[PDB]
Amino acid sequence: LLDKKWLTFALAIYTVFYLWVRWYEGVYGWSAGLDSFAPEFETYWMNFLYTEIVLEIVTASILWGYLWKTRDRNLAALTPREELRRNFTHLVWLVAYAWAIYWGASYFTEQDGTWHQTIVRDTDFTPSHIIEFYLSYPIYIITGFAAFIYAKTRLPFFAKGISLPYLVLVVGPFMILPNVGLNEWGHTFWFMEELFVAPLHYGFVIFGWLALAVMGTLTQTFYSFAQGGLGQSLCE
């Protein structure tokens, strides 16, 4: 069996959900979403913010708790074939993390640009502020934490210790979410120019750099893949 169709679901769920989110923000961007003090803004974007925050907290708790509770206690008695299957599942988790990272840090972030640089601006919770900071960021954080936990709890290579590159890849992009505080402090007060390359944008960037730890993470996963079932063929 080895690599199964969980990868197709991993791609499709993010693609479909974010396409629907884009449709929603295209429909309610203007017209209930321009005026932050209008009653329709509360029903179409503040309610969205509340619901998405509650659902993200619940989903993160449930997913992380399930992954930690179903952790493999007897990692020693794991066959190489099962280890290969678990390595493929972890690679699917990493693919989902990469897809979520794309959607969060490229698509909806540069949609913050197109939005803040064309709209008259108004609150810390613009519809772009509900979709990017509080939906896509949390979603990729949840996916990254889940992938890290799966590696630690199913892969003997990633067990017996916390991998530094994986921890950086998982936590640095997470630090972008608390960095939103610098954003708010970085437009309201310091810098009223809607520049996206302002130093108040450095906390996100600096922590966007930490995603480069995926390189060490991926060579670690390559070594984990090539533990017992490294071949032969490769180097033979």
Partner 1 sequence: HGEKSQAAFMRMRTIHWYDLSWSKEKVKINETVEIKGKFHVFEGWPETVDEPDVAFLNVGMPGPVFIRKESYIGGQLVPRSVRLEIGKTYDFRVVLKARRPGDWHVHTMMNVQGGGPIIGPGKWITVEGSMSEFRNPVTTLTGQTVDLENYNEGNTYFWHAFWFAIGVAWIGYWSRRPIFIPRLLMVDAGRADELVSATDRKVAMGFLAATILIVVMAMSSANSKYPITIPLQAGTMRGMKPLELPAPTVSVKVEDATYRVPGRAMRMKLTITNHGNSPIRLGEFYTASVRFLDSDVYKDTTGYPEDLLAEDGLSVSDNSPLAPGETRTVDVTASDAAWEVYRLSDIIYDPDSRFAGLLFFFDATGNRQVVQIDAPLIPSFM
Ligand X SMILES: CCCCCC(=O)OC[C@H](COP(=O)(O)OCC[N+](C)(C)C)OC(=O)CCCCC
Ligand Y SMILES: CCCCCCCCCCCC(=O)OC[C@H](COP(=O)(O)OCC[N+](C)(C)C)OC(=O)CCCCCCCCCCC
Ligand Z SMILES: CCCCCCCCCC(=O)OC[C@H](COP(=O)(O)OCC[N+](C)(C)C)OC(=O)CCCCCCCCC
What residue type is 106 in one-letter code?
Answer: S
The residue at minimum Cβ distance from ligand Y is: 51
> Minimum CB separation from ligand Z for residue 231, in Å?
23
Q: Is 199 in the site for ligand X (CB under 6 A)?
A: yes
Q: What is the DSSP letter of 130?
A: I
Per CB under 6 A, 102 contacts ligand Z: no
Was 201 annotated as part of a binding site?
yes
Q: Which of 174, 177, 173, 149 is nearest to 162 (CA)?
A: 149
| Least spacing, CB of residue 6 vs ligand Z, in Å | 4
Using rule CB under 6 A, residue 199 touches ligand Y:
yes
Q: Which is nearer to ligand Z, 122 or 165 (CB)?
A: 165
Q: Is 230 exposed, middle or buried (0-12, 13-18, 19+ CB in 10 A)?
A: middle
Q: Which of 5, 26, 69, 73 binds ligand X (CB under 6 A)?
A: 26
Give the C-alpha separation, 142 to 148, whole Å: 10
Distance CA 150, CA 95 (A): 13
Cβ-based burial of 72 (10 A; exposed 0-12, middle 13-18, buried ≥19):
middle
Query: Is 90 annotated for ligand binding?
Result: no
Residues at the contact surface with Cu ion, assessed by CB under 5 A = 183
Residues that bind ligand Z (CB under 6 A): 6, 10, 13, 59-61, 64-65, 67-68, 70, 86, 89, 92-93, 96, 139, 142-143, 149, 152, 154, 162, 171
